[PDB]
Design a protein around this motif. Structure first.
Motif, short mmCIF file in Angstrom:
data_model
loop_
_atom_site.label_atom_id
_atom_site.label_comp_id
_atom_site.label_asym_id
_atom_site.label_seq_id
_atom_site.Cartn_x
_atom_site.Cartn_y
_atom_site.Cartn_z
N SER A 480 -0.01 69.32 48.70
CA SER A 480 -0.79 68.52 49.64
C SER A 480 -0.21 68.39 51.10
CB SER A 480 -1.11 67.16 48.98
OG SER A 480 -0.74 66.01 49.74
N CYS A 481 -1.05 68.75 52.10
CA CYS A 481 -0.74 68.71 53.56
C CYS A 481 -0.26 67.40 54.18
CB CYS A 481 -1.95 69.17 54.36
SG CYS A 481 -2.04 70.97 54.58
N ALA A 482 -1.14 66.40 54.13
CA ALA A 482 -0.89 65.04 54.66
C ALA A 482 0.58 64.58 54.53
CB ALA A 482 -1.83 64.05 53.97
N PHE A 483 1.34 64.85 55.59
CA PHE A 483 2.77 64.56 55.62
C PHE A 483 3.21 63.10 55.54
CE2 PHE A 483 1.31 68.07 58.22
CZ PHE A 483 1.79 69.13 57.48
N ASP A 484 2.38 62.23 56.10
CA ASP A 484 2.59 60.78 56.16
C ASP A 484 2.65 60.04 54.82
OD1 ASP A 484 -0.07 62.03 56.77
OD2 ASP A 484 -0.83 60.03 56.25
N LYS A 659 9.04 86.66 67.40
CA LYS A 659 10.32 87.35 67.20
C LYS A 659 11.57 86.63 67.71
CE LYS A 659 10.91 91.23 68.45
NZ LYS A 659 11.13 92.06 69.71
N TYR A 660 11.36 85.46 68.28
CA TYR A 660 12.47 84.68 68.74
C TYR A 660 12.88 83.71 67.63
CZ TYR A 660 15.67 81.74 70.98
OH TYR A 660 16.84 81.12 71.26
N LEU A 661 11.88 83.06 67.01
CA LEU A 661 12.01 82.03 65.96
C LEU A 661 12.64 82.36 64.61
CD1 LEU A 661 9.54 79.45 66.32
CD2 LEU A 661 10.21 81.06 68.03
N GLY A 662 12.61 83.65 64.31
CA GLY A 662 13.02 84.15 63.02
C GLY A 662 11.61 84.54 62.57
N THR A 663 11.44 85.50 61.67
CA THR A 663 10.06 85.81 61.32
C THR A 663 9.65 84.96 60.17
OG1 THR A 663 11.01 88.03 61.37
CG2 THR A 663 8.63 87.77 61.75
N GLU A 664 10.55 84.90 59.19
CA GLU A 664 10.33 84.12 58.00
C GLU A 664 9.92 82.73 58.47
OE1 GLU A 664 11.64 83.53 53.79
OE2 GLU A 664 13.59 84.18 54.56
N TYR A 665 10.73 82.16 59.33
CA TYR A 665 10.43 80.85 59.83
C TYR A 665 9.08 80.80 60.59
CZ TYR A 665 10.48 77.22 63.46
OH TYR A 665 10.06 76.30 64.38
N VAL A 666 8.66 81.91 61.21
CA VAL A 666 7.42 81.91 61.97
C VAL A 666 6.22 81.80 61.10
CG1 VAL A 666 5.83 83.18 63.35
CG2 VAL A 666 8.17 83.03 63.96
N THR A 667 6.32 82.36 59.90
CA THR A 667 5.22 82.31 58.92
C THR A 667 5.15 80.88 58.33
OG1 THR A 667 5.98 84.55 58.23
CG2 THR A 667 4.07 83.64 57.11
N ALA A 668 6.07 80.02 58.79
CA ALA A 668 6.17 78.62 58.34
C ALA A 668 5.44 77.66 59.26
CB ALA A 668 7.65 78.20 58.21
N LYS A 673 0.75 74.29 60.62
CA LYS A 673 -0.24 73.87 61.59
C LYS A 673 -1.69 74.07 61.10
CE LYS A 673 2.05 72.15 65.29
NZ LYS A 673 3.41 72.67 65.27
N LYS A 674 -1.87 74.49 59.84
CA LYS A 674 -3.21 74.64 59.24
C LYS A 674 -3.66 73.20 58.84
CE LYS A 674 -2.87 75.28 54.15
NZ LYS A 674 -3.88 74.21 53.86
N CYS A 675 -2.72 72.23 58.97
CA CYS A 675 -2.90 70.80 58.64
C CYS A 675 -3.09 69.77 59.83
CB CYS A 675 -1.77 70.28 57.65
SG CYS A 675 -1.00 71.32 56.30
N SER A 676 -2.61 70.07 61.06
CA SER A 676 -2.83 69.18 62.24
C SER A 676 -3.00 70.03 63.51
CB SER A 676 -1.70 68.14 62.42
OG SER A 676 -0.67 68.54 63.31
N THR A 677 -4.20 69.97 64.13
CA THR A 677 -4.60 70.76 65.34
C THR A 677 -4.37 70.17 66.75
OG1 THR A 677 -6.55 71.79 66.49
CG2 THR A 677 -7.01 70.18 64.73
N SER A 678 -3.26 70.57 67.37
CA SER A 678 -2.87 70.13 68.71
C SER A 678 -3.84 70.65 69.80
CB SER A 678 -1.42 70.59 68.98
OG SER A 678 -0.90 70.06 70.18
N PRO A 679 -4.25 69.78 70.75
CA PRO A 679 -5.16 70.22 71.80
C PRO A 679 -4.57 71.18 72.80
CG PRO A 679 -5.65 68.04 71.32
CD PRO A 679 -4.34 68.32 70.62
N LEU A 680 -3.24 71.28 72.89
CA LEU A 680 -2.64 72.23 73.83
C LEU A 680 -2.72 73.64 73.27
CD1 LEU A 680 -1.35 73.09 76.24
CD2 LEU A 680 0.84 72.69 75.18
N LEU A 681 -2.99 73.72 71.97
CA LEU A 681 -3.14 74.98 71.21
C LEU A 681 -4.65 75.28 71.12
CD1 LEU A 681 -0.44 76.17 70.03
CD2 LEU A 681 -1.00 75.09 67.87
N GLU A 682 -5.45 74.30 71.53
CA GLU A 682 -6.89 74.38 71.56
C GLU A 682 -7.31 75.20 72.79
OE1 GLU A 682 -10.33 71.17 71.07
OE2 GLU A 682 -8.67 70.28 69.96
N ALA A 683 -6.92 74.77 73.99
CA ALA A 683 -7.26 75.46 75.26
C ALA A 683 -6.14 76.29 75.94
CB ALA A 683 -7.88 74.47 76.24
#
Ligand SMILES: [Fe+3]
Ligand SMILES: [Fe+3]
Length: 689
Positions: A480-484, A659-668, A673-683
């Motif tokens: 389950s996503c909901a981290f709180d 390629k800076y983050l680590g790749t394994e970590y990038v797939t993380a 973020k499939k759980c909370s949508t930031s507006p700076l990632l929106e536009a």
């Protein structure tokens, strides 16, 4: 409701009368009955939105950069869409469509006449006079541009300039008397259908209009002939070579509803409804983008498919682009004043604390590095975009909310290390930090196994050790996503305030700013959110090994980060085990890379070369670091740089955000973020188009 009607602004009678060919066919078909408003000059309507009597309006961008300074305050709500179907182009072009026979090239637009659509319009001023700008040899420290773009052209017709101070600059103009060279289609030569026409007769020479405007007035193909263009490389091509004769890509025209209160979604709702009903190719004894024979492009540019919807964080300065934010700025920026901001950088300093340390270095450089000071850091990576800040040092998560935003890694805050002690710090590569979950040995009923329902602590909201690895590890077992929910009541400096996430912060000293991604949030940061478990606010405070280490055992200053015994705290491990703050070696949820700086890949290459300087004067080996000034030191709070970091390593290659983050970590991050949508990632992934 005094708001269930869109007051559109009409600048004519036939655009005002298309607006009534439009007010009838609408609320009958069912929708907010459109009000249509009477007006004139391009701003007598950019103003009438700003004053609340005219509620919408469709513009070119050179003008939407204008309707969005601070005098008025209007955000574009709907980008206008271009081209044909298998290919609808949401941006546009800006060429110089000249007559087969005039032998000049672009480097020869000196002295001849001209033909601008308009003054302020992109394709014909924001775009093309900086393309030519070099021989303008216009002086700002004396004269103005519309002033020394008169000395250049022996005769031109740009509308909207003063018929009184710029005669040469209102000479090849065919409008009716006082309507001559005026800010409207009252000047027959005003627009791609006024500036094209400016040459088809011979009066006005170069016509600076888009790529397909020849097309609209010149149906016949055995008519697109008499016009060899002008390209960037001083040449000429057919009206179909619009592509390689471009001068640059500019977003198309937009619609302008006030920053706040212009009823942004009623304005769009009329358009759920326009694009379909009277869309191009559907219902026609009234098209949406079309005026009868003899009038061009009223309301919406003739032949254009329609409108798009723009994601509210993207306004005025933001839509025009950065490649084009180089057009609109350049000119009103002197020639010696354009390098003032190119051998210069701007440190997006997030807060009044990360901001004051800047301003000691805004001048400790001798004024080569200035500030861009927002209070989030989702506000600030955005400011890296708007030709407003070179870069800044973001920590993983934020390199991913600034990795979908276009930012690609420069230098890495390689802190000091021992393995591979061997090399040079720059030339020594990233031996990172090991994310961790420390608790008190007092907490004997806690090992990762037993974490649900207990309290939490998380540095900032997205990041590595204080979130990504925690809330991105508390999701891999879980499901389950909901981290709180996993945690009782936590402190999450950056997310929903009235939640069980900020349900445990402190803010400043007055009590204010409870839960905030800016350090004043007492329990914010590796050291702020280490206080979180270090002042029994929580059962745990996700940290970086080094934060339990450098705020206890006699190392801070601090009356909190002093009497503590590091060996009072155990490091919650991964197999339901427990080791001292000591054995953080086999134990750490996961190893991760340090925080690199982020600027756009046109602003990359220079922020490398200034910081590959200041990490070396006020660098830890800085000649001017422990004495004059240390660019990394900051009394166990850490303003801008890891109090820890030694240098600013060379990352090498050109490693994307990924390629800076680590790749394994990038797939993380992506899967989290499939759980909370930031507006700076929106536009931000709307800025590529
Ligand atoms: Fe335009
Ligand atoms: Fe980090």
């Amino acid at each position: 409701a005094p708001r269930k009607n869109v007051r559109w602004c009409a600048i004519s009678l036939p655009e005002w009368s298309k607006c009534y060919q439009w007010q009838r066919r609408m609320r009958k078909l069912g929708a907010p009955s459109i009000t249509c408003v009477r007006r004139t000059s391009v701003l007598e309507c950019i103003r009438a939105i700003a004053g609340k009597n005219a509620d919408a309006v469709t513009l070119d961008d050179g003008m939407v950069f204008e309707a969005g300074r601070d005098p008025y305050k209007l955000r574009p709500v709907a980008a206008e869409i271009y081209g044909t179907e298998k290919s609808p182009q949401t941006h546009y072009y800006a060429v110089a469509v000249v007559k087969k026979g005039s032998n000049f090239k672009l480097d020869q637009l000196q002295g001849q006449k001209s033909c601008h659509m308009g003054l302020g319009r992109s394709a014909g001023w924001n775009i093309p006079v900086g393309i030519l700008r070099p021989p303008l040899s216009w002086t700002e420290s004396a004269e103005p541009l519309q002033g020394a773009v008169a000395r250049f052209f022996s005769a031109s017709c740009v509308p909207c300039v003063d018929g009184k101070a710029y005669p040469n600059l209102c000479q090849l103009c065919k409008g009716v008397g006082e309507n001559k060279c005026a800010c409207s289609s009252q000047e027959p030569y005003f627009g791609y259908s006024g500036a094209f026409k400016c040459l088809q007769d011979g009066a006005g020479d170069v016509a600076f209009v888009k790529e397909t405007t020849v097309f609209e007035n010149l149906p016949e193909k055995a008519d697109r002939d008499q016009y060899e263009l002008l390209c960037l490389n001083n040449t000429r091509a057919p009206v179909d070579a619009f592509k390689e004769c471009h001068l640059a890509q500019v977003p198309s025209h937009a619609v302008v509803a006030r920053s706040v209160d212009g009823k942004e979604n009623l304005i769009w709702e009329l358009l759920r409804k326009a694009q379909e009903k009277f869309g191009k190719n559907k219902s026609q004894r009234f098209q949406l983008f079309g005026s009868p024979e003899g009038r061009r492009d009223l309301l919406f540019k003739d032949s254009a498919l329609g409108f798009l919807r723009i994601p509210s964080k993207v306004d005025s300065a933001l839509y025009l682009g950065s490649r084009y934010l180089t057009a609109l700025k350049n000119l009103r920026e002197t020639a010696e004043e354009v390098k003032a901001r190119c051998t210069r950088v701007v440190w997006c300093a997030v807060g009044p604390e990360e901001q004051s340390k800047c301003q000691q270095w805004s001048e400790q450089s001798g004024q080569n590095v200035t500030c861009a000071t927002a209070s989030t850091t989702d506000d600030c990576i955005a400011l890296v975009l708007k030709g407003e800040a070179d870069a800044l040092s973001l920590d993983g998560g934020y390199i991913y909310t600034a990795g979908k935003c276009g930012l690609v890694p420069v230098m890495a805050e390689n802190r000091k290390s021992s393995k591979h002690s061997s090399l040079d710090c720059v030339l020594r590569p990233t031996e990172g930090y090991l994310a961790v979950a420390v608790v008190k040995k007092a907490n004997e009923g806690l090992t990762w196994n037993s974490l649900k329902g207990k309290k939490s602590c998380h540095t900032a909201v997205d990041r590595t050790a204080g979130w990504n690895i925690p809330m991105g590890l508390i999701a891999n077992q879980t499901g389950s996503c909901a981290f709180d929910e996993f945690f009782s009541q936590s402190c999450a400096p950056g997310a929903d305030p009235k939640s069980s996430l900020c349900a445990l912060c402190a803010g400043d000293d007055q009590g204010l700013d409870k839960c905030v991604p800016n350090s004043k949030e007492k329990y914010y940061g590796y050291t702020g959110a280490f206080r979180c478990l270090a002042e029994d606010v929580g059962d745990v405070a996700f940290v970086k090994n080094d934060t339990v280490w450098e705020n206890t055992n006699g190392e801070s200053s601090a009356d909190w980060a002093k009497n503590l015994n590091r060996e009072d705290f155990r490091l919650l491990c991964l197999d339901g085990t427990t080791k001292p703050v000591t054995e953080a070696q086999s134990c750490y949820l996961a190893v991760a890379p340090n925080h690199a700086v982020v600027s756009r890949s046109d602003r990359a290459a220079h922020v490398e070369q200034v910081l590959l300087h200041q990490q070396a004067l006020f660098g830890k080996n800085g000649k001017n670091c422990p004495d004059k000034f240390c660019l990394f030191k900051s009394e166990t709070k850490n303003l801008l740089f890891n109090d820890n970091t030694e240098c600013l390593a060379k990352l090498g290659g050109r490693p994307t955000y990924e390629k800076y983050l680590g790749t394994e970590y990038v797939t993380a991050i992506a899967n989290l973020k499939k759980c909370s949508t930031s507006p700076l990632l929106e536009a931000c992934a709307f800025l590529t188009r």
